[PDB]
C-alpha cells in the first residue's frame, strides 16, 4: 500500500487505515 504524498485533515495516513486498505483498496495510487 502506497503512502499518500501529503497528509490531510480528512485523510490522515494512519497505520490502521493502511492495514484496512490491504483488503479494502490495495491498488490506491496515493498520488494527489
Give the closest residue to 1 by CA, choosing from 30, 12, 10, 16. 30
DSSP-assigned letters across all residues of 1-32: -PPPSS--SSS---HHHHHHHHHH-TT-----
Structure determination method: cryo-EM
**Can you say whether residue 23 is alpha, beta or left, with left for phi > 0 and alpha for psi between -120 and 50 degrees?**
alpha
Q: Are the beta carbons of 4 and 13 closer than 8 angstroms?
A: yes
CA distances from 10 to 2, 7, 27 (A): 17, 9, 20
Report resolution (Å) to 1 decimal: 4.8
Amino acid at each position: 500500500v502506497q503512502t499518500q504524498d501529503f497528509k490531510t485533515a480528512v485523510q490522515p495516513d494512519t497505520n490502521t487505515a493502511q492495514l484496512i486498505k490491504t483488503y479494502s483498496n490495495p491498488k490506491q495510487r496515493g498520488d494527489k
